[PDB]
Amino acid sequence: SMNPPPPETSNPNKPKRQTNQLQYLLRVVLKTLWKHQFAWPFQQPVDAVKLNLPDYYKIIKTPMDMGTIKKRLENNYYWNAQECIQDFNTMFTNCYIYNKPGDDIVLMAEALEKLFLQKINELPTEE
Numbered sequence: 626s627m628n629p630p631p632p633e634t635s636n637p638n639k640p641k642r643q644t645n646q647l648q649y650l651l652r653v654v655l656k657t658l659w660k661h662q663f664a665w666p667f668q669q670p671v672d673a674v675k676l677n678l679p680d681y682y683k684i685i686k687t688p689m690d691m692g693t694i695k696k697r698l699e700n701n702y703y704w705n706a707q708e709c710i711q712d713f714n715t716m717f718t719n720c721y722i723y724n725k726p727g728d729d730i731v732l733m734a735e736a737l738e739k740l741f742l743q744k745i746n747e748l749p750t751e752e
């Protein structure tokens with residue numbers, strides 16, 4: 626089968642900013658999740674071919690992963706923190722949509738999401 630192109634991480638005509646909230650999303654939020662023992666399945670787009678999941682991109686139409694988020698943050702792709710927060714939430718939601726309750730991958734997403742919520746609870750006010 627075939628994978629779709631990954632989400633874009635570069636777009637020169639999309640307005641961009643570097644804000645203190647976005648810096649926090651990279652330095653604290655992404656870094657915290659990335660190093661977690663359960664991060665690995667989320668560090669790159671789902672390879673539906675290698676995983677033999679031909680229905681994945683039939684069901685998931687807005688794919689997202691932390692590899693993409695990391696690149697977006699490092700390359701200042703975002704205008705605001707809410708855009709990036711939405712990407713994280715999309716990543717988690719996709720996992721819950723595609724998989725079954727209790728599946729290992731769902732337990733992994735839940736652990737990462739718990740940490741995500743802990744960190745964004747202390748998102749700094751905009752400077």
Ligand SMILES: Cc1noc(C)c1-c1cnc2[nH]ccc2c1
Binds near residue numbers: 665720724730
């Ligand atoms: C399946 C599935 N649904 O969401 C995610 C993330 C996956 C997913 C992604 N990469 C993986 N690598 C090894 C297992 C594995 C599972």
